[PDB]
Design a protein around this ligand. Structure first.
Ligand code: HEM
Ligand code: HEM
Ligand code: HEM
Ligand code: HEM
Lengths: 142, 146, 146, 142
């Protein structure tokens, strides 16, 4: 699915945003949790589900950190992501449907923060990046 | 469906700031660019051949306004949305055969353009929460009536 | 929802040949094996860890009969299925927060099992059509009610 | 993405299934058309859309012969399918939603005609195969 234009367009995008990666991770994660309260069932061991809370800020930073790794290995996602895929299918057994939800909250936050830079054409490429990302995360489920 | 008075006023303050003439055309343009299979439902429109043509197309624009008008109709009838949409449902189910997943995609492009316009201070998690419950009622009500 | 008499009759006649013992445990197993994440809602059931374990699991089997039991309720209430599934809906979507896509996957697992049992003669396109419409109502009614 | 165990199940199943492949295609296409009438709009230019009609039978052998090659070519589904991505995703702007409706009618038909063989374990691998094919047809969307 990712074309050479998606790569350039998302790589360039990553460089702009991303000083603010942790921000985006905590803004996207905490939004998913209140907006879609069915994703809460997976993190109910935390302290602290609300927007801005420490567990969200800390888990936000991680999510966006592995999305950075994924962008550096964008030509071999299929490799960069397979271990996250064993963990999500097998130890956490996250319903694949939830991935679409995080990625929407993530397009929302990009763009809420960089409106500026989130043309419909950048939106295309980002959204394809993140379906690819879900598609690779799905590798290990069955 | 029950609304909180927090929801009600969140929805109403947000809608109150939306320029329908701006968000409407913008949200429809973004759906046809980001989910371009969706162009086939609108091939009476032009000239959907590229992002530029989409943004310059008068029928896209007009129709983005008309979509915000569907939303405004749910706004004024928030306790009975399903009934307000009954004809709309039939036209999108029984007549256009728009696969429901598309109503989700448009609602998402609407959200994105709202977020982009208002930024972090106005497009608060709690606001997104209530906006989203609202769009999920709309989408539901659009969306086959069994 | 209004059911033609063609549909009612297609539905009652399919239903009346279903071995619920049998179609039940097959549907659920196929579901746990084809859509493995769904195993998460069913951690009460033990092991689970492989195809042979799943359908060598006595509780799966027994819950598959319960699923068919729910389908019957809808059969006996097909003019008011939503009202009949009212507390089912609460349970699945207020209290187990099963994503709605899973109801379609189960419903699809059932349809394959029934088609496997019955063959082309049997499970004709027309019969599948009305069966499908039945599952779609069951599935909408199991989802959050607005 | 297909594991080496998936290819085997599919290559194997195809070897069992392939004599009846015209009828799998006929039965699948025409159940799609009647059970999900939303799909009928894509074929409105055919004379007859009813099950068993001539255009239905002819087009079903076509779907399945292309499914045939993708099985032959199952290590490289992309190059193998790209021809058909452009058709479906660029020219006909087929809703990606219908890809799963077809693959479902496919599965129902395979299991209906070969219950013997259609174990949940064959089913997972065929399902995965059909989604890969969908993912491959998705390339020229955007
Ligand atoms: C873009 C999608 C995602 C990425 C890149 C991602 C990445 C991660 C990472 C990097 C971890 C920590 C791994 C470690 O501890 O070594 C984690 C854990 C986790 N994820 Fe995800 N994740 C994603 C989506 C999701 C979604 C949609 C859900 C479900 C709502 C989810 C549920 C969880 C849970 C429950 C944990 C464990 C947190 C804990 O320690 O309790 N994840 N993920
Ligand atoms: C939030 C979701 C939506 C709302 C509130 C909405 C609302 C409306 C309204 C108010 C109309 C005008 C009705 C009339 O002429 O009487 C309309 C028509 C139409 N809708 Fe939607 N709509 C929605 C989503 C969609 C989606 C997702 C599609 C599929 C891509 C779609 C396709 C169409 C088409 C093709 C027309 C007719 C255009 C014409 O013939 O002039 N709609 N809708
Ligand atoms: C075809 C649609 C479905 C029907 C008709 C159905 C029906 C039922 C019924 C009749 C019960 C027993 C409820 C009671 O005690 O009164 C039940 C329980 C339950 N359902 Fe479903 N269900 C469907 C889909 C699903 C799906 C997709 C999931 C999750 C992946 C699920 C998860 C559960 C669980 C976890 C229980 C309680 C099990 C226990 O005894 O521990 N159901 N359902
Ligand atoms: C495995 C998933 C699918 C596969 C392998 C597939 C395979 C094929 C093949 C080989 C062709 C021949 C195209 C040509 O040379 O004209 C074709 C054509 C075509 N397909 Fe598909 N196809 C799939 C899904 C769909 C779906 C889900 C739809 C619409 C619901 C669709 C609509 C069409 C149409 C309208 C043509 C033109 C038919 C004609 O004009 O004769 N396809 N497909």
């Amino acid at each position: 699915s990712l074309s050479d234009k998606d790569k350039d367009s998302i790589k360039a995008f990553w460089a702009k945003i991303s000083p603010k990666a942790e921000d985006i991770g905590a803004d996207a994660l905490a939004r998913m949790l209140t907006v879609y309260p069915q994703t809460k069932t997976y993190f109910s061991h935390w302290k602290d589900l609300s927007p801005g809370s420490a567990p969200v800020k800390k888990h936000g930073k991680t999510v966006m950190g592995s999305v950075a790794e994924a962008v550096s290995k964008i030509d071999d996602l299929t490799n960069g992501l397979l271990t996250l895929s064993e963990l999500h299918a097998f130890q956490l057994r996250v319903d694949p449907a939830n991935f679409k939800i995080l990625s929407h909250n993530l397009l929302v936050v990009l763009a809420q923060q960089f409106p500026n830079d989130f043309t419909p054409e950048v939106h295309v490429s980002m959204d394809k990046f993140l379906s690819l990302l879900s598609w690779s995360l799905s590798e290990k489920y069955r | 469906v029950e609304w909180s008075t927090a929801e009600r006023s969140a929805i109403a303050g947000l809608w109150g700031k939306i320029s329908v003439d701006e968000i409407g055309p913008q949200a429809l343009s973004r759906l046809l660019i980001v989910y371009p299979w969706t162009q086939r439902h609108f091939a009476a429109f032009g000239n959907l051949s590229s992002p530029a043509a989409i943004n310059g197309n008068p029928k896209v624009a007009h129709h983005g306004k008309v979509v915000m008008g569907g939303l405004e109709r749910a706004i004024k009838n928030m306790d009975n949305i399903k009934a307000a949409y009954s004809s709309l449902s039939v036209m999108h189910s029984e007549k256009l055969h728009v696969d429901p997943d598309n109503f989700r995609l448009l609602a998402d492009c609407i959200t994105v353009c709202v977020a982009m316009k208002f930024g972090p201070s106005a497009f608060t998690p709690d606001v997104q929460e209530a906006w989203q419950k609202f769009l999920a009622v709309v989408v539901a009500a659009l969306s086959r009536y069994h």
